[PDB]
């Protein structure tokens, strides 16, 4: 199959700080891929981390190539687009769908954590869907190593996206990586079941966050959410990261294990 790497750019799939992501269609194979085209006039690290990842719930990395100041990253294309666009404003989505997506999210995150990588910016805009609605974690531009040679490193850089960030990132100088990812997964689950985000940020200066800590679940978004998934959100959206539920224990939750969706 000669000329297997020859692509034509057809559409702006997204747009970041450095550059954009484009859909690129192949020559002889006719393959489709996504290309992150960053204009340097960070990505070095983003490539290194990308080179480590091999999981069915992580957007696959193919390769890279620079031409002067413009670094190209060739990555798996996700024709289902962002999870963000499967969430109906003020409604969310059907609970069986949210559950499946959450199962796949946990699988992707467990994998990353297992190899000592934290994503640090999990949100529906970064969670993409393949042709069969399978969820793929993307955009490792903020990601970093939290474990190496079996030895955990505490994080201190504030980053991510405020509605999704865990409160210790706003309150403590140092914090453990994995609980921060767990928290953002909870915010994602809330958005899926409610079609709204619970607060601007989890600080005591935010009334919606204060309401949540006071357990006023008779307010939105919580009142839209069934008791079972809500009980899980109570365990995830815990202000103390050391008390917060861990992924092994999320996997044992009653809602997490509730039979909801028929197979294809
Ligand atoms: C009008 N809508 C705009 C948003 N749309 C849309 C959004 C995102 C994608 C899309 C598909 N595959 C993708 N593979 C990727 C790999 N890495 C990144 C990054 N960073 C981003 C992607 C990526 C984005 C494709 C479509 C759906 C259509």
From Swiss-Prot:
* Region (Interaction with CLSPN) location: 1-256
Q: Tissue expression, per UniProt?
A: Expressed ubiquitously with the most abundant expression in thymus, testis, small intestine and colon.
Q: Any idea where the Protein kinase domain is?
A: 7-256
GO CC, sorted alphabetically, is: centrosome; chromatin; condensed nuclear chromosome; cytoplasm; cytosol; extracellular space; intracellular membrane-bounded organelle; nucleoplasm
> What positions does the entry give for ATP binding?
13-21, 36
Here the cross-link named Glycyl lysine isopeptide (Lys-Gly) (interchain with G-Cter in ubiquitin) sits at 123
Which GO terms are recorded in the biological process aspect for this UniProt protein? apoptotic process; apoptotic process involved in development; cellular response to mechanical stimulus; chromatin remodeling; DNA damage checkpoint signaling; DNA damage response; DNA repair; DNA replication
Q: How is its activity regulated?
A: Activated through phosphorylation predominantly by ATR but also by ATM in response to DNA damage or inhibition of DNA replication. Activation is modulated by several mediators including CLSPN, BRCA1 and FEM1B. Proteolytic cleavage at the C-terminus by SPRTN during normal DNA replication activates the protein kinase activity.
What top-tier enzyme class does this entry carry? transferase
Instruction: State the post-translational modifications.
Output: Phosphorylated by ATR in a RAD17-dependent manner in response to ultraviolet irradiation and inhibition of DNA replication. Phosphorylated by ATM in response to ionizing irradiation. Ubiquitinated. Mono or diubiquitination promotes nuclear exclusion. Ubiquitination and degradation are required to terminate the checkpoint and ensure that activated CHEK1 does not accumulate as cells progress through S phase, when replication forks encounter transient impediments during normal DNA replication. 'Lys-63'-mediated ubiquitination by TRAF4 at Lys-123 activates cell cycle arrest and activation of DNA repair.
Per the entry, what this protein does is: Serine/threonine-protein kinase which is required for checkpoint-mediated cell cycle arrest and activation of DNA repair in response to the presence of DNA damage or unreplicated DNA. May also negatively regulate cell cycle progression during unperturbed cell cycles. This regulation is achieved by a number of mechanisms that together help to preserve the integrity of the genome. Recognizes the substrate consensus sequence [R-X-X-S/T]. Binds to and phosphorylates CDC25A, CDC25B and CDC25C.
Written domain comment of the UniProt record: The autoinhibitory region (AIR) inhibits the activity of the kinase domain.
How does it associate, per the subunit comment?
A: Interacts (phosphorylated by ATR) with RAD51. Interacts with and phosphorylates CLSPN, an adapter protein that regulates the ATR-dependent phosphorylation of CHEK1. Interacts with BRCA1. Interacts with and phosphorylates CDC25A, CDC25B and CDC25C. Interacts with FBXO6, which regulates CHEK1. Interacts with PPM1D, which regulates CHEK1 through dephosphorylation. Interacts with TIMELESS; DNA damage-dependent. Interacts with FEM1B; activates CHEK1 in response to stress. Interacts with TLK1. Interacts with XPO1 and YWHAZ. Interacts with CDK5RAP3; antagonizes CHEK1.
Identification of the protein by name = Serine/threonine-protein kinase Chk1
What is the taxonomic lineage of the source species?
Answer: Eukaryota, Metazoa, Chordata, Craniata, Vertebrata
Placed within the complete protein, the shown segment runs 3 to 273 of 476
